[PDB]
CSV table of C-alpha atoms in Angstrom, one decimal:
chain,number,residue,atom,x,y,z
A,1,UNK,CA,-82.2,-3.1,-204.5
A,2,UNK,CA,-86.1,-2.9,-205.1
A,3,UNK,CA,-85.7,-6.7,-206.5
A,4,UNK,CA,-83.3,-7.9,-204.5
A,5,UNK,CA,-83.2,-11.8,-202.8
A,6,UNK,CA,-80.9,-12.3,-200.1
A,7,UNK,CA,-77.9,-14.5,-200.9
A,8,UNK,CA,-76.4,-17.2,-198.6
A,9,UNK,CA,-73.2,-18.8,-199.5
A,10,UNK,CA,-72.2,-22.3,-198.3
A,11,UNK,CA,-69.4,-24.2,-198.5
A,12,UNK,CA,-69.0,-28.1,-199.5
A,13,UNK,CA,-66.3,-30.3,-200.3
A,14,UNK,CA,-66.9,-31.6,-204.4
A,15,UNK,CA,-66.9,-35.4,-205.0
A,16,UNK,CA,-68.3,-37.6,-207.8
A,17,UNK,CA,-71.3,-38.0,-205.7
A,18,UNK,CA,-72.1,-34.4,-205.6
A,19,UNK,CA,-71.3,-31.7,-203.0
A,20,UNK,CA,-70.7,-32.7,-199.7
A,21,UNK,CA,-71.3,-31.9,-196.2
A,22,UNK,CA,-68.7,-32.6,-193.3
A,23,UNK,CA,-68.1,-35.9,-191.4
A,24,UNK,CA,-70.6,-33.2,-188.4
A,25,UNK,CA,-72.9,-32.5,-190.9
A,26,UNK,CA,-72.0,-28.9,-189.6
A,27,UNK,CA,-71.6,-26.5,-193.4
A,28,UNK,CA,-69.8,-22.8,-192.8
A,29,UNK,CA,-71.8,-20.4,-194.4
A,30,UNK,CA,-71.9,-16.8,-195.0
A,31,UNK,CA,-74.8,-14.1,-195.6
A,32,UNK,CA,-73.9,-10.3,-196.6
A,33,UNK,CA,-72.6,-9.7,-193.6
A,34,UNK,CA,-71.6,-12.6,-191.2
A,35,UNK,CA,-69.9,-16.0,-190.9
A,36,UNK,CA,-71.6,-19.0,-189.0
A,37,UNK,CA,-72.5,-22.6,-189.0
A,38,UNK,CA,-75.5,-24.6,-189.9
A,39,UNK,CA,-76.5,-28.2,-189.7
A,40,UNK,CA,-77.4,-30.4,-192.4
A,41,UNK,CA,-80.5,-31.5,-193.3
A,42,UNK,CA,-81.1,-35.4,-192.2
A,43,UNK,CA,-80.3,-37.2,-195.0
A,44,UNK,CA,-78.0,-35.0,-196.6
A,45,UNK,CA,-74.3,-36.7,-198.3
A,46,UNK,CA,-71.4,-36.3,-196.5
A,47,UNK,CA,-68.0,-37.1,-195.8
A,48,UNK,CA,-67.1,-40.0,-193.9
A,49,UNK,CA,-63.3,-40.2,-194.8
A,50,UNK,CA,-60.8,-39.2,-197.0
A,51,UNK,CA,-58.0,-41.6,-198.0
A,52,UNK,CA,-55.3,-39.4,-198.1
A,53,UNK,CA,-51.9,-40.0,-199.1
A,54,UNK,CA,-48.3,-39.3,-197.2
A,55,UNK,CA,-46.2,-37.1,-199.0
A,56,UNK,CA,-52.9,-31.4,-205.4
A,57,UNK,CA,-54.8,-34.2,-207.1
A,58,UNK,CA,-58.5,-36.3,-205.9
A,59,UNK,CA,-58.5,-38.7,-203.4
A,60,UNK,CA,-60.7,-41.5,-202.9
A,61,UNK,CA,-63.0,-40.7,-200.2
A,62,UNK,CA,-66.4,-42.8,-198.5
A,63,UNK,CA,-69.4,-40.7,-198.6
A,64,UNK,CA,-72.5,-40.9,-195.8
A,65,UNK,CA,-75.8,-39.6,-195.0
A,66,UNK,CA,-76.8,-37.0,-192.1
A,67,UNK,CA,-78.5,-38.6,-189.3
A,68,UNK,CA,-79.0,-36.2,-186.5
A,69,UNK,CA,-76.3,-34.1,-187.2
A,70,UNK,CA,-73.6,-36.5,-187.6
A,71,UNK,CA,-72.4,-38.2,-191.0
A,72,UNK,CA,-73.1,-42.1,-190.8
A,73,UNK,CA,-72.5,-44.8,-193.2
A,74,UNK,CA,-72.7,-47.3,-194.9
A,75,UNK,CA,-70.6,-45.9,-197.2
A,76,UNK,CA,-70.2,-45.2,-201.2
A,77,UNK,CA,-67.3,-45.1,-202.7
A,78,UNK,CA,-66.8,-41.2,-204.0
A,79,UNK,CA,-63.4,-39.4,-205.4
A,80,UNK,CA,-63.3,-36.1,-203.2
A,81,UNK,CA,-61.5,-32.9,-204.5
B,1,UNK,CA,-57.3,-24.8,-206.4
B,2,UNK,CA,-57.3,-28.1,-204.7
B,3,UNK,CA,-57.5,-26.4,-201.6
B,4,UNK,CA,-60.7,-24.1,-202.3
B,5,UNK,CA,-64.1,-25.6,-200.8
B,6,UNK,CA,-67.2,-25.9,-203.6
B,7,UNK,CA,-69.2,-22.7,-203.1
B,8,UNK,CA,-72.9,-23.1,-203.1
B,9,UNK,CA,-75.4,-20.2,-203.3
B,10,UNK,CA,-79.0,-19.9,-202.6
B,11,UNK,CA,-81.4,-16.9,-202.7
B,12,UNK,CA,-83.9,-15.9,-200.3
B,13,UNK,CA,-86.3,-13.6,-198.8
B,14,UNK,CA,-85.3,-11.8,-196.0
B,15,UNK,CA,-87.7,-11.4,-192.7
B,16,UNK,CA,-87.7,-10.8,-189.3
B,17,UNK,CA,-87.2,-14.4,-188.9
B,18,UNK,CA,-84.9,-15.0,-191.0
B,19,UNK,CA,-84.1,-15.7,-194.3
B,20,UNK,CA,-87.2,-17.9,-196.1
B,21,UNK,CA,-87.9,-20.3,-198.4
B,22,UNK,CA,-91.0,-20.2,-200.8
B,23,UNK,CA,-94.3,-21.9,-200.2
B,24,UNK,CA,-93.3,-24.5,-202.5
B,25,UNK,CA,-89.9,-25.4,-200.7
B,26,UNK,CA,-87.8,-25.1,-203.2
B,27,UNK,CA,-85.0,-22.5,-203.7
B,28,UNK,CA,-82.9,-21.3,-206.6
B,29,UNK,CA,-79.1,-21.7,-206.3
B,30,UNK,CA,-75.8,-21.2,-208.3
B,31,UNK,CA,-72.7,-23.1,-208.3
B,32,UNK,CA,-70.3,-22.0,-210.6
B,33,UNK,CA,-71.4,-21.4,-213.6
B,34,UNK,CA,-75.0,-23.5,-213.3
B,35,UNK,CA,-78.1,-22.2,-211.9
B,36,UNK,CA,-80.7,-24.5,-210.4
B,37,UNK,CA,-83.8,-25.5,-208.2
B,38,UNK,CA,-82.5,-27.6,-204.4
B,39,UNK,CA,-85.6,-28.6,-202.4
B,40,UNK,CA,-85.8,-27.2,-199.2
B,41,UNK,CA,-84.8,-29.6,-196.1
B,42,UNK,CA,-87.6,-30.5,-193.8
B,43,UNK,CA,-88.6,-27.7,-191.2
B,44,UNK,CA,-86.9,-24.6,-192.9
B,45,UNK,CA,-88.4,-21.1,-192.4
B,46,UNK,CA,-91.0,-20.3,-195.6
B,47,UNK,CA,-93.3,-18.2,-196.8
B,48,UNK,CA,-96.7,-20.0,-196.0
B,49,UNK,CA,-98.8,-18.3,-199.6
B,50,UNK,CA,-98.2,-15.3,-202.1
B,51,UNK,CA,-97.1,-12.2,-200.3
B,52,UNK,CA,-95.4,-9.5,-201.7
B,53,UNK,CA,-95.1,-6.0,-201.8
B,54,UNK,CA,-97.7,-4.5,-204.3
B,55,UNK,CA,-95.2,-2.6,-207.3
B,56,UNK,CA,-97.6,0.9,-207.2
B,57,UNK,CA,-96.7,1.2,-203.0
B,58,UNK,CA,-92.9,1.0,-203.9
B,59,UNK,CA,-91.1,4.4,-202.6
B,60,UNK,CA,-88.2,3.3,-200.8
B,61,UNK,CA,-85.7,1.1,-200.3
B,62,UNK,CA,-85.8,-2.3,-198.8
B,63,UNK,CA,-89.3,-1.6,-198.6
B,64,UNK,CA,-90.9,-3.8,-195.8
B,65,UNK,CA,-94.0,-5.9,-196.3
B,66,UNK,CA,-96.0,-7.9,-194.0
B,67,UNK,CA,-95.7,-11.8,-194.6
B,68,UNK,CA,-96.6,-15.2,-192.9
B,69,UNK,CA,-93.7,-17.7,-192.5
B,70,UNK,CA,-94.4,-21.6,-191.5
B,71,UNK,CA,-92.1,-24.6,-192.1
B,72,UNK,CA,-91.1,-26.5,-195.0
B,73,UNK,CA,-93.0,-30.3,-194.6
B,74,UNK,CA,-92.3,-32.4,-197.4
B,75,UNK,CA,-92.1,-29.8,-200.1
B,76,UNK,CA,-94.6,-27.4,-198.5
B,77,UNK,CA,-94.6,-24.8,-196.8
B,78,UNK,CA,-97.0,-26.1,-193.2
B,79,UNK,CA,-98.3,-24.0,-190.2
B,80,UNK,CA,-98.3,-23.0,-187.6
B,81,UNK,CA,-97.8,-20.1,-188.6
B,82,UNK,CA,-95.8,-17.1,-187.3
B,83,UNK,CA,-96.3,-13.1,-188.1
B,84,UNK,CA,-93.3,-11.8,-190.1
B,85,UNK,CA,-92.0,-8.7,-191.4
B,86,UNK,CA,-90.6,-9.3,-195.0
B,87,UNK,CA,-88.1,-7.1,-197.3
């Protein structure tokens, strides 16, 4: 515009320990215009595993920190939607 | 529904080196309906002080404005710093 900030849209996977970050701390994002990747900062949750089911609904799933670009544990104990 | 990822959007300022962060590291963002403050993760692009394009010079679009961008260092914005073109 005249007053306009530039928006960046990432995407996370919702748990009861907030929004979370893949098991390669690696989150797809998009600006205006493109699609790309970018890493998590260390420290950040994210996914370690999802206990899925054989067969919708939450599933529990173990939640980790970032540590150099990879999600390690130990873990927490989440629900993941 | 369940298969839709949780959207999260922040707001920048844009620059020749990308988009920054503001001296203070911390950036608004929405999810859903909530707007809120994140911190800014260690060594993101920022704006090292308060630069901005005076209102009275405003006579275009997008109007570009000189700006200094360093990295975020425990919730400030450190040098070095780097010579950027803001909008």
């Amino acid at each position: 515009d005249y007053t306009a900030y530039a928006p960046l849209t990432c995407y996370f996977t919702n748990s009861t320990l907030g929004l979370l970050a893949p098991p390669n701390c690696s989150v797809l994002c998009n600006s205006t215009t493109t699609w790309f990747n970018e890493t998590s900062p260390n420290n950040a949750s994210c996914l370690l595993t999802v206990d899925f089911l054989t067969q919708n609904q939450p599933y529990n799933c173990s939640v980790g920190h970032c540590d150099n670009g990879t999600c390690a544990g130990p873990p927490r104990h989440a629900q993941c939607w």
